[PDB]
Symmetry: C2
Subunit: 537 residues, 2 copies
C-alpha cells in the first residue's frame, strides 16, 4: 500500500510514499533545471556580443563560434541522456554534470575578470579596430564555454526525468499532487525565461560581464547544493536503457557480417533469421553485439523511414540560429532609445520568447477544441502539419528579415529607427512553437514500440545540425564574392546582410516543398506496408 515496487530510496531499500515524495522534494531537484535553462539563454542569447564587444571579433566569426558552441551544447545533451540511460543514474548524471556546469561558468566568469586575459578595451563598429584577441585569451573563453556547453548538456538531459520520479505511483492522488505542482512550475520558467532574456541580459550588458556571468555561476553552485541536500528525500529510477543502443547493434553488428543473402524468406530461431543483415527494403516481424534478431532489425528500419522528414527539419533551426547571432549585430545598429531608457541589443530575443509563450497559449485554448468541433480530430494539428507550418515561417522570417535589412540600409546610407526587428524575432518565434510540437509528436507515435525515446535523439540532433549547418551556411558565403563587400560586415552599413537572410529564406522555402513530398510519400509507404503485412499474413 504505502510501500512501492516502483522506486527505491537512496539506500536501495524499496521506496515509501509518505517518506520519499515531491510536494516539496521535487523542487530541490528541479531548481537545477531552472538555473540551467536560465543560464544557456542569458548566456547563449547574448554570448554573440561578448565576442564582438570585448573579444573584438568580426561579426561573422562571432556568429560561427556561438552557433557552434550552441550546437555543440545540443550534441552533448544528446549524449548525456545516453549516459544517464546506459551508465550513471538519472541522479548522479544530474549531480555530476551540474558540478561541471558550475566550473565552466566559473572559469567563464573568471575569464572576464583577471586582467590582460581580454584584449585592451575599445569598440569595433563605426569607431575603431583593436588587438584582435590573443591566442591565450581565446583558449580560456573556449574551455569555459565548452565546459559550460558540456555541463548544461548533461543536466538538460537528465534533471527533468528525475524530478518527476518523485510523484507517479500509478495511484491518482499523487498524479494529482503532481499535475497540480507543474502547471504552477512552468508559469515560473516561462515568466522566468522572459526575465533572463531581459533582466539577466541587462546585467551582463550594463553592469558588466563579471556580474552577469557571476550571478549565473553562483546560481548553479547554490542549486547543486540544494539538490544534493535533498538526496535522501528522493526515490530512485532503475536505469531506463537508451534505445540508441540496438540501433548501434544492427547498423554495426549486421555490418560485421556481410555475407550470403540467405533468403529462404525468413529462417527462425526465436525471432532471429545463423545471420541477420540489413537490406533496408521490407519484411515484417513481431515479438515480445554478435548476431542480430530480425524483429530487432526491422525496428531499426522504421527509424530509417522517419529519417527523410528528420532531414528537412534541420534547416528551420538554421533560421532560428540567425536570431541568436545576426539579428543581434543588426540590433547593434538600430535605435533602441526610449529616452532615459536604452534597451539591451540582444534583448530583442524577448520578442522571440514572447511569440513562443503567446503562440503556445493561443494554440492550447483556441486551436485544440476548435478541431474536435470542426473535424474528426480533437488533437489539433497531429503531427506533421505543424512541422510543415514551421518550415514555412522559417522562410517568412528570413524573407521579412531580408526585407528589413534593406529599409535599415536605406536610412543609414544618405539616424533613428527600430521596432523593425520584431517581426523576424516574432515569426521565428511563432514558427518554432509549432514545429517543435510537431517534430516531437511525430517522432513519438511514429517511433517503434519499445524503441521510442529514440525521439529526443531525432529531435535534439536536428537542433544541433540546424546550428552546425548555420555555421557551414555562413562559411560558404565567404567565398561567393569575397572581395569588396560580400554579405557579412563589421560596420554592417559597410556590408549587406539581406543577401544571407534571402538565401536562408529560399533554402528553407525549397526545403519545405521537399518536406511536402517527403510527407506525402512517407505515409503512402507506411500505409501500404501496414496493408501488405496483412495480405501475406
Amino acid at each position: 500500500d504505502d510501500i512501492l515496487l516502483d522506486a527505491w530510496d537512496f539506500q536501495g531499500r524499496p521506496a515509501d510514499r509518505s517518506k520519499t515524495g515531491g510536494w516539496a522534494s521535487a523542487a530541490m531537484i528541479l531548481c537545477i533545471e531552472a538555473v540551467e535553462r536560465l543560464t544557456t539563454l542569458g548566456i547563449g542569447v547574448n554570448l554573440v556580443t561578448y565576442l564582438t564587444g570585448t573579444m573584438h571579433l568580426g561579426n561573422a566569426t562571432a556568429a560561427n563560434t556561438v552557433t557552434n558552441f550552441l550546437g555543440t551544447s545540443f550534441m552533448l545533451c544528446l549524449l548525456g541522456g545516453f549516459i544517464a540511460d546506459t551508465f550513471l543514474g538519472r541522479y548522479l548524471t544530474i549531480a555530476i554534470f551540474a558540478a561541471i556546469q558550475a566550473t565552466g561558468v566559473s572559469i567563464l566568469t573568471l575569464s572576464t575578470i583577471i586582467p590582460g586575459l581580454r584584449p585592451p578595451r575599445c569598440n569595433p563598429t563605426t569607431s575603431s579596430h583593436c588587438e584582435q584577441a590573443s591566442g591565450i585569451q581565446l583558449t580560456v573563453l573556449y574551455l569555459a564555454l565548452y565546459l559550460t556547453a558540456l555541463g548544461t548538456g548533461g543536466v538538460k538531459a537528465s534533471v527533468s526525468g528525475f524530478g518527476s520520479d518523485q510523484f507517479d505511483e500509478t495511484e491518482p492522488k499523487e498524479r494529482s499532487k503532481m499535475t497540480y505542482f507543474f502547471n504552477r512550475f512552468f508559469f515560473c520558467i516561462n515568466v522566468g525565461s522572459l526575465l533572463a532574456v531581459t533582466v539577466l541580459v541587462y546585467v551582463q550588458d550594463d553592469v558588466g560581464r563579471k556580474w552577469g556571468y557571476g550571478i549565473c555561476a553562483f546560481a548553479i553552485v547554490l542549486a547543486l547544493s540544494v539538490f544534493l541536500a535533498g538526496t535522501n528525500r528522493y526515490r530512485f529510477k532503475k536505469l531506463i536503457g537508451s534505445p540508441m543502443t540496438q540501433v548501434a547493434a544492427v547498423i554495426v553488428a549486421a555490418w560485421r557480417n556481410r555475407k550470403l543473402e540467405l533468403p529462404a524468406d525468413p529462417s527462425y530461431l526465436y525471432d532471429v533469421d545463423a545471420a541477420i543483415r540489413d537490406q533496408e527494403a521490407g519484411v515484417t516481424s513481431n515479438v515480445f553485439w554478435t548476431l542480430s534478431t530480425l524483429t530487432d532489425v526491422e525496428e531499426v528500419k522504421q527509424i530509417v523511414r522517419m529519417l527523410p522528414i528528420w532531414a528537412t527539419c534541420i534547416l528551420f533551426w538554421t533560421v532560428h540560429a540567425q536570431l541568436t547571432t545576426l539579428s543581434v549585430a543588426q540590433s547593434e545598429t538600430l535605435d533602441r532609445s526610449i529616452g532615459s531608457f536604452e534597451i539591451p541589443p540582444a534583448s530583442m530575443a524577448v520578442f522571440y520568447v514572447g511569440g513562443l509563450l503567446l503562440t503556445t497559449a493561443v494554440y492550447d485554448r483556441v486551436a485544440i477544441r476548435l478541431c474536435k468541433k470542426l473535424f474528426n480530430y480533437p488533437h489539433g494539428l497531429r503531427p506533421l502539419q505543424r512541422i510543415g507550418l514551421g518550415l514555412f515561417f522559417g522562410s517568412m522570417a528570413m524573407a521579412v528579415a531580408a526585407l528589413v535589412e534593406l529599409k535599415r540600409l536605406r536610412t543609414a546610407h544618405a539616424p533613428l529607427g527600430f521596432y523593425l526587428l520584431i517581426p523576424q524575432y516574432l515569426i521565428v518565434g511563432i514558427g518554432e512553437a509549432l514545429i517543435y510540437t510537431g517534430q516531437l509528436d511525430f517522432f513519438l507515435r511514429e517511433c517503434p514500440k519499445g524503441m521510442k525515446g529514440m525521439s529526443t535523439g531525432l529531435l535534439l540532433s536536428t537542433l544541433a545540425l540546424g546550428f552546425f549547418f548555420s555555421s557551414v551556411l555562413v562559411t560558404i558565403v565567404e567565398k561567393f564574392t569575397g572581395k569588396a563587400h560580400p554579405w557579412i560586415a563589421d560596420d554592417l552599413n559597410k556590408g549587406r546582410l539581406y543577401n544571407f537572410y534571402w538565401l536562408v529564406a529560399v533554402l528553407v522555402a525549397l526545403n519545405f516543398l521537399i518536406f511536402l513530398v517527403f510527407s506525402k510519400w512517407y505515409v503512402y509507404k507506411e500505409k501500404r506496408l501496414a496493408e501488405v503485412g496483412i495480405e501475406l499474413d
Copy 2:
C-alpha cells in the same frame, strides 16, 4: 578470479582488483581534502583581521567570532562523521557537505565584493570612530561562515575514510601502493600548509579579501567537479557503523528496577547488555583525561586571534617587503612540522631502544608534555606582551612573537599524537571511531572555552582598563595571557593526578 568482496560499485555490483580503485584514483577524491585543509587554514588563520579591519568589530568581540566559528566547525565535523556512518554514505557525505562548503565560501566571497555589504573603508588604527558592521552585513557574514563551517565540518569527517577506501584489500601487494601515494600526498599538504598561512594570507591581505576568499571558492568548485567526475571508478565500502550508537544504548537503557559505573564484571566477546555497558564504562574512565585536553586547545585559539592583533602592531618589516600580520602563524605550522619530523627520526628510534616502548613516549607522556608547553607558551607570551607594552609607552620586530607561535607548535604535535594515540589504544572492541569523536570534542570544547574566557574578563574589567582592549596599547593583554598560563598550569597538575589514577584504576580492571 580477481574481484573483491565487501566492496561494491556505484551500480551496487561488486567489485575489482585491477580496474576500479587507484594509484591516482584516490588523487581525485583527495582533491577535496587538500582544498578543504588549505581553505580552513587560509580563512581561519586570518579571519580576525577581516573582522577588526573591515567589519570594525574590535578585538575582544572579533576574537570571539573567530573562535566560535572554529569551535562550531569542529562541533559540526563530529556530527558530520556520525551522519556519514549512520544515514548518508561516506561518498554522499563528502559530495553533499562539499557542495554546502562551496556555497558557504561563495557567499563569504560575495559578502566581500557586493557593494554596501560592509562598513565603509577605514582602519580603527588611524581612525577615531569606525562603524561596526550593521545587523545585516553581519547576517550575510554569519550565514556565510556557519555554512562554510558546516560545509567544512562534514567533509573533514568522511574524505579521509573514503579516500583510503580505494586501496583497502587485505593485501601486501596493492594495499602497499597505498603507502607510496599517501606519502607524496601528505608531504604536499605540509608544503601547501606552509603556503596557506603565507601566500593565501598574503593574497587576502595585500591583493584583497575578494581575491583571497574568491580563490578558495573556485578551489572546491574545482575539486567537487573532479571528485564527482570520478564516481564510476570508485570502490564503495559497506557502511561502517558509529561507535557512538553502541555508546548511547547504555545511556538510555538504564532506568530500571542497569548501569552504576564504579567497578563491575569483565567482558567476553533497546535493552542493555553488560559487555557493552562496561565498554561504555571504561570509555568514561578516560573522560577525566579527555577533560584535561580541552584547556590545551584554549591555548591554541589565542594563536588565531589576539596573537594576530599583537602581531599587527609589531614591526614585521624585512628590508623592503613587510610580512602580513596573521602570517606569523607560519612559525606555528613550522614548529608543528619540525617537531614531528624530528620525533619520528629520533624519539621513535632511540626511545624504544632503551625502555622497550611501542611509540616514542607513552601517550600520556606526550599529552602531559603538550599541556606543559601549552601552559608555558602563555607564560612567555604574557611576559613578551608585558615587555612589549612596557616599551610601547616608553620598535619590536615580529621576532618577539616567534616564541609563542613556536612553543605552541612544538607543544601541539605531541599533545595531538599523544591524545590521538591514547584515545585510540584505550578504546574497546568495536569503538575506534569513538577516538576521533573524543579528539575533535576536546578541540571544539577548547575553542568554545576561550570565548567564555574572553567574555568573562570583558565583563569584569571593562569598560575602564581592560585586559583585552580595542587599542592594544591601551590595555593589559599580558595578564589575560598570565591567566590562561596559570589556568593551563593548574589543569596540567590535575592531569598528573588523573593519569596517576587512570593507570592505577585501569590496571585493577585488567586481570580476570
